[PDB]
Short mmCIF file of C-alpha atoms and ligand atoms in Angstrom, two decimals:
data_model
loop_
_atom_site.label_atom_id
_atom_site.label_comp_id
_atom_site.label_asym_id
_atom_site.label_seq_id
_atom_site.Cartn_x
_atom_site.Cartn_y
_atom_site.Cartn_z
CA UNK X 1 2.91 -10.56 -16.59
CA UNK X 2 1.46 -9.74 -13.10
CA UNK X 3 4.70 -9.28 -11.33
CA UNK X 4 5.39 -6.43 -13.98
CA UNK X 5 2.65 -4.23 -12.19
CA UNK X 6 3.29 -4.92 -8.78
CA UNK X 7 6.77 -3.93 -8.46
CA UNK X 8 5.81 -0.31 -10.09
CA UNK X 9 3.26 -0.08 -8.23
CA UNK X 10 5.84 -1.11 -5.22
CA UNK X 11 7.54 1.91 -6.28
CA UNK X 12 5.07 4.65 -7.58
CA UNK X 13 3.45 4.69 -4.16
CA UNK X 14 6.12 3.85 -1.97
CA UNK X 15 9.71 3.61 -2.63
CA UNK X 16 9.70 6.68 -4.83
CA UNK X 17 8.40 8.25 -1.82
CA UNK X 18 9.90 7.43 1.51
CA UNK X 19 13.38 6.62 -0.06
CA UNK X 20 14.32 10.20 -0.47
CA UNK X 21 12.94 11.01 3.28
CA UNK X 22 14.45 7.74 4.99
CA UNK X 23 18.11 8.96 5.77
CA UNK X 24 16.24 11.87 7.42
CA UNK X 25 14.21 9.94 9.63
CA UNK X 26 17.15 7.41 10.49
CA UNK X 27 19.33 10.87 11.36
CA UNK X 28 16.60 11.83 13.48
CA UNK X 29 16.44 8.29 15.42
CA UNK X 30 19.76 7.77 16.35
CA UNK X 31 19.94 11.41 18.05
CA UNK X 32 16.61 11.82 19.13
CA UNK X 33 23.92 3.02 15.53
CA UNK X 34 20.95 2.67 12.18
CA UNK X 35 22.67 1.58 9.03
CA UNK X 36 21.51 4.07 6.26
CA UNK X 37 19.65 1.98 3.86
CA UNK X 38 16.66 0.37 3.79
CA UNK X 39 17.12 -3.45 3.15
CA UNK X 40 14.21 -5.51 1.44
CA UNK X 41 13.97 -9.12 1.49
CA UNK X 42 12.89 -10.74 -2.14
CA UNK X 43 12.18 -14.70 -1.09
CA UNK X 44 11.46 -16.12 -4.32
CA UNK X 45 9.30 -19.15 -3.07
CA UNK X 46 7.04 -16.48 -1.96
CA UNK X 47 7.12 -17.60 1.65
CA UNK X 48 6.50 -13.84 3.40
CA UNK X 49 5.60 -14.36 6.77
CA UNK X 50 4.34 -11.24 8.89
CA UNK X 51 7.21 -11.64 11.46
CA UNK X 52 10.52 -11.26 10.85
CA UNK X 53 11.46 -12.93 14.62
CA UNK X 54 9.96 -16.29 13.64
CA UNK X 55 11.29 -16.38 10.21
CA UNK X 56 14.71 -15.98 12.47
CA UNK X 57 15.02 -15.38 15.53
CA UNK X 58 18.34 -13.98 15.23
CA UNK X 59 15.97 -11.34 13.61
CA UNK X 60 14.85 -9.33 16.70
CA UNK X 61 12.58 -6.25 16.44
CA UNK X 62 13.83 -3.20 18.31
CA UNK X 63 11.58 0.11 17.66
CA UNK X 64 9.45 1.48 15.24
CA UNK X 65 11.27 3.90 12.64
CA UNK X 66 9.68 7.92 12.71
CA UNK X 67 6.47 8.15 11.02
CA UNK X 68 6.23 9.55 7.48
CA UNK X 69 3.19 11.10 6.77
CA UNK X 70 2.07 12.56 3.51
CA UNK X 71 -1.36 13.45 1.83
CA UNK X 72 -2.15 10.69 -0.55
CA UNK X 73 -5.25 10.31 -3.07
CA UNK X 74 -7.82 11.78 -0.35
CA UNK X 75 -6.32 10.34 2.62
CA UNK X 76 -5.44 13.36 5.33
CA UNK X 77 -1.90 12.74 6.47
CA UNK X 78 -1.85 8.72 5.95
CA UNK X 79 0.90 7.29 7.98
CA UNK X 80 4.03 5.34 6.45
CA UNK X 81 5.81 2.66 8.83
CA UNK X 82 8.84 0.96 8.86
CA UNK X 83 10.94 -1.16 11.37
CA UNK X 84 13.81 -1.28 13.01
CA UNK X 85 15.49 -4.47 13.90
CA UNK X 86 18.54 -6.34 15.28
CA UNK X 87 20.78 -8.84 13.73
CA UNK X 88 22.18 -11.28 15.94
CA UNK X 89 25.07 -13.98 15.62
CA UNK X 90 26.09 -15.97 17.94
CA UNK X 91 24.16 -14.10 21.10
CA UNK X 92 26.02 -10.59 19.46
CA UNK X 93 24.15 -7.36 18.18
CA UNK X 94 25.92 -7.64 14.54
CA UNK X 95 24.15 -5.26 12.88
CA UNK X 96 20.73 -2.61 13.00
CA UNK X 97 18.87 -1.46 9.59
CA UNK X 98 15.59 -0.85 8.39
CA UNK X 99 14.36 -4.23 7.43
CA UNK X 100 11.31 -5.69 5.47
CA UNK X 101 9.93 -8.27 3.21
CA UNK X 102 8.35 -6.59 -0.02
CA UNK X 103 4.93 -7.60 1.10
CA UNK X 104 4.14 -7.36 -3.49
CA UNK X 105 5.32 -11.24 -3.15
CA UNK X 106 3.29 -11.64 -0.36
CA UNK X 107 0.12 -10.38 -2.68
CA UNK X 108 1.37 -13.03 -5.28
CA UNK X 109 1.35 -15.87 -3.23
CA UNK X 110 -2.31 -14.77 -1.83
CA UNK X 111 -3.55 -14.30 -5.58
CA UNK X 112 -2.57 -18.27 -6.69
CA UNK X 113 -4.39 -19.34 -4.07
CA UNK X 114 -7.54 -17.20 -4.98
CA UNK X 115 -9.40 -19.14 -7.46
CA UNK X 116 -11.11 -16.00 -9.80
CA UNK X 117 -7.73 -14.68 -10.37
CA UNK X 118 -6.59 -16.98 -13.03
CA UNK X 119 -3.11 -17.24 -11.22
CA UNK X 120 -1.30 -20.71 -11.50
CA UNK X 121 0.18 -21.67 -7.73
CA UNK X 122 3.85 -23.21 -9.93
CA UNK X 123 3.60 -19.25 -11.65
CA UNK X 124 4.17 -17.97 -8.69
CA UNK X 125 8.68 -18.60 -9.01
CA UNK X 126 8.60 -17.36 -12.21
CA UNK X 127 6.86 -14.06 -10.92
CA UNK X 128 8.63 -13.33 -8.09
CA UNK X 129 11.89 -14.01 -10.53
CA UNK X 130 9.85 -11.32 -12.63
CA UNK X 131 9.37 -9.26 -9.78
CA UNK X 132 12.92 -8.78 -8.74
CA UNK X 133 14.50 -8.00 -12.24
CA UNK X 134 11.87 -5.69 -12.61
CA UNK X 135 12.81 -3.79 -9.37
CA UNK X 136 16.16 -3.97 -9.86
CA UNK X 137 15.90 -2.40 -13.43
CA UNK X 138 13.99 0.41 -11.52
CA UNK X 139 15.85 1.13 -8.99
CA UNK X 140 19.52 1.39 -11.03
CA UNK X 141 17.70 3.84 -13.17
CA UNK X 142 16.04 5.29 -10.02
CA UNK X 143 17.24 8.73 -8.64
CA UNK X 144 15.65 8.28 -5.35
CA UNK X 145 17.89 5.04 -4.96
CA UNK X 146 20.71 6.95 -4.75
CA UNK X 147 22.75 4.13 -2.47
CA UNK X 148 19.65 4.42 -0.24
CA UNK X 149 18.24 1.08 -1.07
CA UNK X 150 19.67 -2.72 -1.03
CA UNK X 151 17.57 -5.33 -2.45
CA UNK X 152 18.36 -8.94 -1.41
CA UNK X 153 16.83 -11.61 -2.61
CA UNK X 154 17.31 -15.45 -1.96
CA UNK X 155 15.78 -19.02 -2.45
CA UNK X 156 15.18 -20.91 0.81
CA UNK X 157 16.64 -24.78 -0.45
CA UNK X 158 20.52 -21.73 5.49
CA UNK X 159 20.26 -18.37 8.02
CA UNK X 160 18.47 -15.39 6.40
CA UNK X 161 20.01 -13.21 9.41
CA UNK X 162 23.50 -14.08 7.53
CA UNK X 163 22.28 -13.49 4.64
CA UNK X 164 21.37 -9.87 5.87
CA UNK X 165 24.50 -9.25 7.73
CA UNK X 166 26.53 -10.46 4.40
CA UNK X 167 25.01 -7.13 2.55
CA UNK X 168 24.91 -4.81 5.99
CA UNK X 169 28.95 -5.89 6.95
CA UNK X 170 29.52 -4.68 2.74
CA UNK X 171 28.38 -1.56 3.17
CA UNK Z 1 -3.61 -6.10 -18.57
CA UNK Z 2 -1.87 -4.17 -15.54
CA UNK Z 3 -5.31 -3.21 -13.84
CA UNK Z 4 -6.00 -7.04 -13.29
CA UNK Z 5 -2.97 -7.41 -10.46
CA UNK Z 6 -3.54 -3.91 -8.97
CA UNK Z 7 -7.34 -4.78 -8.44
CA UNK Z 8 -5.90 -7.76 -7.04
CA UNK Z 9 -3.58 -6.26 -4.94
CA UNK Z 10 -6.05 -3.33 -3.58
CA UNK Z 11 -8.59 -6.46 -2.20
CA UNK Z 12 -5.73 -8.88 -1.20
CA UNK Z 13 -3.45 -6.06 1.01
CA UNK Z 14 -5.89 -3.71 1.64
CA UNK Z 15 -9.77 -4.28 1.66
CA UNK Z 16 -9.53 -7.87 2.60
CA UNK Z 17 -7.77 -6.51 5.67
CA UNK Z 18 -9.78 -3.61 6.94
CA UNK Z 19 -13.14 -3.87 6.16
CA UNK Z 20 -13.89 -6.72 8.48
CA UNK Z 21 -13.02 -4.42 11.06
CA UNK Z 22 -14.60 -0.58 9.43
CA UNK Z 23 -17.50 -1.02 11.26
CA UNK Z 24 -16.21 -1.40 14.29
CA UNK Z 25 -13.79 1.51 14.41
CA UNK Z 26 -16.78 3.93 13.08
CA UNK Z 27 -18.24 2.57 16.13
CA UNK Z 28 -15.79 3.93 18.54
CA UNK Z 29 -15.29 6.87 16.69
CA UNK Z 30 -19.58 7.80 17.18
CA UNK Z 31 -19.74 7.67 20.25
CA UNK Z 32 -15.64 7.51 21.89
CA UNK Z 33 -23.41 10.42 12.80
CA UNK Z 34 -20.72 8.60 10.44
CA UNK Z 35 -22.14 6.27 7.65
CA UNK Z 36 -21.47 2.59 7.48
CA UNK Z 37 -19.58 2.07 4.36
CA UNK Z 38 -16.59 3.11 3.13
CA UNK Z 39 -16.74 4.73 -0.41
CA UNK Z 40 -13.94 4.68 -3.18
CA UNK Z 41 -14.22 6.80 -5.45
CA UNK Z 42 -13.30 5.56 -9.53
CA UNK Z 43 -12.49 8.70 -11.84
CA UNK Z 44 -11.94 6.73 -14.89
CA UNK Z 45 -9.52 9.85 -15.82
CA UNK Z 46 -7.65 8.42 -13.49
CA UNK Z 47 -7.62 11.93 -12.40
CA UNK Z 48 -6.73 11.35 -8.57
CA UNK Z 49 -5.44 14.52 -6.49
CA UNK Z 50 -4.35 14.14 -2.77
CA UNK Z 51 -6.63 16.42 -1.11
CA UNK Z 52 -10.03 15.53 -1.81
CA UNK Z 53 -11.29 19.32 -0.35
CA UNK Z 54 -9.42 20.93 -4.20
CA UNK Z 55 -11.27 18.37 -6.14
CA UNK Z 56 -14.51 19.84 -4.67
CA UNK Z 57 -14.75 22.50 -1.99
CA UNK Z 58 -17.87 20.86 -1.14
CA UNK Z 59 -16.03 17.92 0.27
CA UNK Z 60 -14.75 19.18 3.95
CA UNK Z 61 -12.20 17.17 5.79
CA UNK Z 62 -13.30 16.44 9.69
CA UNK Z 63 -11.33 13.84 11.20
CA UNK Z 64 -8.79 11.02 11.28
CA UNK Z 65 -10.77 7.51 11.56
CA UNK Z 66 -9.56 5.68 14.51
CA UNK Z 67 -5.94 3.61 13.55
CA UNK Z 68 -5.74 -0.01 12.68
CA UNK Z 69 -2.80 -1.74 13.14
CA UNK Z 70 -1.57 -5.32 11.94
CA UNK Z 71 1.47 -7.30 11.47
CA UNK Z 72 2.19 -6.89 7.81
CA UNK Z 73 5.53 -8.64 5.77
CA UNK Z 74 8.01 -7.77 8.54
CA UNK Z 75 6.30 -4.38 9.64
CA UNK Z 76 5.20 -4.47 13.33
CA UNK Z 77 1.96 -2.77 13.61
CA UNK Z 78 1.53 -0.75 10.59
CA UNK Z 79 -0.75 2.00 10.39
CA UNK Z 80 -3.80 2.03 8.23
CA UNK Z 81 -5.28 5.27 7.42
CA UNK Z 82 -8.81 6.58 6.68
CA UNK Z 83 -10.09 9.84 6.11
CA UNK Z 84 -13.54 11.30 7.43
CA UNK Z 85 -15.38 13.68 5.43
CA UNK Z 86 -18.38 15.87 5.70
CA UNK Z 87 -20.20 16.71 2.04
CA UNK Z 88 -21.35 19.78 2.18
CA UNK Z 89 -25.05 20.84 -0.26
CA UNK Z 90 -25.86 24.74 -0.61
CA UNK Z 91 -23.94 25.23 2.45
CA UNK Z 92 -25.13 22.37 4.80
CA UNK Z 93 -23.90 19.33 5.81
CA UNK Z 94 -25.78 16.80 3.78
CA UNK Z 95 -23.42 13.39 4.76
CA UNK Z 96 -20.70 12.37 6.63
CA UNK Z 97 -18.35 9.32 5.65
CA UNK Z 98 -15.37 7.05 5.14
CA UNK Z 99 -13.96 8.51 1.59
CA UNK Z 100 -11.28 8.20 -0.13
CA UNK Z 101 -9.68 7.53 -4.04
CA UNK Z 102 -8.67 4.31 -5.32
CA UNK Z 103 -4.89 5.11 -4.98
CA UNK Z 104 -3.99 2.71 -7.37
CA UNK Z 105 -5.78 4.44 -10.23
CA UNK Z 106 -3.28 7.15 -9.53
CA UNK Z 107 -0.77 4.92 -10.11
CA UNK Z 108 -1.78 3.97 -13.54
CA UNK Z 109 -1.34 7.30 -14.27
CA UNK Z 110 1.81 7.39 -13.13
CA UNK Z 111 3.19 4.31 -14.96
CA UNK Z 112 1.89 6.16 -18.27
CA UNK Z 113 4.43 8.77 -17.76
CA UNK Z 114 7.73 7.08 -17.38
CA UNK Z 115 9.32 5.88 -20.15
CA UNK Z 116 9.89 2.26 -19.28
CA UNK Z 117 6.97 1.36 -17.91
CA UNK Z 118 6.11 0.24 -21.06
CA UNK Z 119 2.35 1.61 -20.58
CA UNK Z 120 1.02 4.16 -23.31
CA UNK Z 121 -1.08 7.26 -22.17
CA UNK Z 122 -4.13 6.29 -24.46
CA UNK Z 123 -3.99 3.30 -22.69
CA UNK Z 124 -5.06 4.77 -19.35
CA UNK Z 125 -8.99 4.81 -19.91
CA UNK Z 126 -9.30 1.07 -21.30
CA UNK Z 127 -6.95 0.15 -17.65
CA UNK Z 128 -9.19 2.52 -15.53
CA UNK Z 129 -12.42 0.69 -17.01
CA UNK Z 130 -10.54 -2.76 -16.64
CA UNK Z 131 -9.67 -1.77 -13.08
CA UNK Z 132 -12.83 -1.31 -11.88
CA UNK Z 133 -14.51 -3.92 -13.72
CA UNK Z 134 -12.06 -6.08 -12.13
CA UNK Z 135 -13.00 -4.83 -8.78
CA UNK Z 136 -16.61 -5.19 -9.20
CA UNK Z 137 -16.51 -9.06 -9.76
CA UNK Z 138 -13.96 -9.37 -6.69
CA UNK Z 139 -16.34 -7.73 -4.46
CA UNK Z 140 -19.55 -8.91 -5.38
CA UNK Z 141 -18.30 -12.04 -4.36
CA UNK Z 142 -16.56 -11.11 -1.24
CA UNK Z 143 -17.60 -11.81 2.23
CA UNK Z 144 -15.41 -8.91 3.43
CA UNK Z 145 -17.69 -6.83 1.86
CA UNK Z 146 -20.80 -7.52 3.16
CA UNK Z 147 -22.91 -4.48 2.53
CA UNK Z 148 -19.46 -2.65 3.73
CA UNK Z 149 -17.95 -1.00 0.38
CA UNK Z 150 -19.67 1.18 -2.17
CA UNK Z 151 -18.01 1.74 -5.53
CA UNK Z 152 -18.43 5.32 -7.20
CA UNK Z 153 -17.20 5.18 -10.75
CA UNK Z 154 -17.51 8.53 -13.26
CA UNK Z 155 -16.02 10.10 -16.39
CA UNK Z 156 -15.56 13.92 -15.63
CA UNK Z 157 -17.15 15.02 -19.11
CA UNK Z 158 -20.16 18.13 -13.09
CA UNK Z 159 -20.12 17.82 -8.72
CA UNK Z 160 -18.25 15.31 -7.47
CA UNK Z 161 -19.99 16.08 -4.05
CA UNK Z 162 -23.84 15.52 -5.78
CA UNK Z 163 -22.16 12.27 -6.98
CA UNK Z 164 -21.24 11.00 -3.97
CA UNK Z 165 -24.82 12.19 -2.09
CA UNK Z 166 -26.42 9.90 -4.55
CA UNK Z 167 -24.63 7.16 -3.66
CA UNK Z 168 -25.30 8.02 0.04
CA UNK Z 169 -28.80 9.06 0.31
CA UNK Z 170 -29.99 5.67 -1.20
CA UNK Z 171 -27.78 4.35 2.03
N1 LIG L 201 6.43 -0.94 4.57
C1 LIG L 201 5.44 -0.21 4.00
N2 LIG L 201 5.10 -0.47 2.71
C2 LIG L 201 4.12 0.22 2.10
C3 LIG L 201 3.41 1.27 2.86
N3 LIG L 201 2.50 1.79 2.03
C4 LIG L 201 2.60 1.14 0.84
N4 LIG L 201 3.58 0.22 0.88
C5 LIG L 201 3.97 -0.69 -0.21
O1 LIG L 201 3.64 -0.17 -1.50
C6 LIG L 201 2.64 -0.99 -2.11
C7 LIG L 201 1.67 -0.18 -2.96
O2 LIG L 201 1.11 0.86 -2.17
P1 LIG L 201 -0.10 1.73 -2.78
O3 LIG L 201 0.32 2.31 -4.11
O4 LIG L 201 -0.45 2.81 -1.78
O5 LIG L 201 -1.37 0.76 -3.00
C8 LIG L 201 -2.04 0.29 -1.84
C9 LIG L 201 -3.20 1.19 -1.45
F1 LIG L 201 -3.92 1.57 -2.55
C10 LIG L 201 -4.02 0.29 -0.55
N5 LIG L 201 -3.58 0.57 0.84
C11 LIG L 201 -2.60 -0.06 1.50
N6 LIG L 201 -2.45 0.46 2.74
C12 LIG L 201 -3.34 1.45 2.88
C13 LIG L 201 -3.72 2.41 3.94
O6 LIG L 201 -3.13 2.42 5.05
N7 LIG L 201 -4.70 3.28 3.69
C14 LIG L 201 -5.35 3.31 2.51
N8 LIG L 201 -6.34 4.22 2.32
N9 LIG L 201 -5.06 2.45 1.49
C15 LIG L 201 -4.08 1.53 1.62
O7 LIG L 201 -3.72 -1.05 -0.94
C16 LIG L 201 -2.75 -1.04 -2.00
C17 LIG L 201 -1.81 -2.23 -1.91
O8 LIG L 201 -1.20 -2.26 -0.63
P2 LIG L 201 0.01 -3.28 -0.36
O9 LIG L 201 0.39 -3.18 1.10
O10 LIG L 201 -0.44 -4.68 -0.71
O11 LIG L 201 1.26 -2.87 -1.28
C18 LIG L 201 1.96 -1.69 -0.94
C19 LIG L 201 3.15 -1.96 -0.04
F2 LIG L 201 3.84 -3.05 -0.49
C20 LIG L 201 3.83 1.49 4.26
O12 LIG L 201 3.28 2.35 4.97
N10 LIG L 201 4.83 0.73 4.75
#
């Protein structure tokens, strides 16, 4: 359905095009330690907020990650961002990545709530559900992904920071 | 179809965002002239290079607009970028504006070419249309876009430069 479009579109203009430039830009933060994989978080209710601290605040923002810039449909040098931040447990720094929500879900939840976009607010499960097994199936098939990318998603019924440090400790 | 979300998506994560606050950074970029409006350009090709200066020497790059930054799904102040450009006419600067492509046209494109995207080449035209019908009706009833965003749809069958003018003289 909607989701379908969304998460290649969250990989046409994005992840197809930072992934293969993010170890680079990690490798150049650390000297100038940052896991080496960029870690998305897929909350299937939808719930996105735009910080990570208050959805946690084990989550704790550190720095920003190196700029990417790249000329992009008639925009001069347009600027890519990412951040970096801390996982805490128990008052301990138990982990560092690049960490964000896929803001795609974030869009969904903002479209239900529009009326003119004939988008059911109980659709909105089944499309982030859609969503993620549509990225997935991308990104296993994905060259760019080559063990440069973790998905992780979840369903709030619980610490997202261990849910995060579960993946980061595996790797 | 697919066009429906990524319309959807371009207003909700994008226009929705920074158009309530265009005007004011052409402000400070006048005087810390520039037109008002910020105009997207529609090839219904879905013909969408990244430097706008190739698809017409006419079109001459100037400067960066001034940053905007926002909490975004995790992100810390993420960059948003816009592109100044001067058109040029028989050698003399005729306008000066916001311009860009509709990136996700390019996408559309895109999806048409790998293989499990499920999305047909023929099918790009019919999307392109859809897309920018879809956009239309969003922002014709949008507040954002109060006299802020001007639409510039065309079918290469030509100056892309005398096409935007148009648009810009009746400004
Ligand atoms: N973390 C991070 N993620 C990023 C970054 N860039 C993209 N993504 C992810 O990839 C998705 C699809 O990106 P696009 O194919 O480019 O389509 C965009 C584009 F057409 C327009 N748009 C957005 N920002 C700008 C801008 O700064 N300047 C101009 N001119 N246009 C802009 O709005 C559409 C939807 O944006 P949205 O944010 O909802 O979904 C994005 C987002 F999830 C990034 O720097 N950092």
């Amino acid at each position: 359905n909607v989701a379908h479009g969304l998460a290649w579109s969250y990989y046409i203009g994005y992840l197809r095009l930072i992934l293969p430039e993010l170890q680079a830009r990690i490798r150049t933060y650390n000297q100038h330690a940052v896991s080496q994989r960029l870690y998305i978080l897929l909350p299937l209710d939808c719930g996105v907020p735009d910080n990570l601290s208050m959805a946690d605040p084990n989550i704790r923002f550190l720095d920003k990650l190196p700029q990417q810039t790249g000329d992009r449909a008639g925009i001069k040098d347009r600027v890519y961002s990412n951040s970096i931040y801390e996982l805490l447990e128990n008052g301990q720094r138990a982990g560092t990545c690049v960490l964000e929500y896929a803001t795609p879900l974030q869009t969904l939840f903002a479209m239900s709530q529009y009326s003119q976009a004939g988008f059911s607010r109980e659709d909105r499960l089944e499309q982030a559900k859609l969503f993620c097994r549509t990225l997935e199936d991308i990104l296993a098939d994905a060259p760019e992904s080559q063990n440069n990318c973790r998905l992780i998603a979840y369903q709030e019924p619980f610490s997202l920071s261990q849910e995060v440090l579960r993946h980061l400790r595996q790797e």
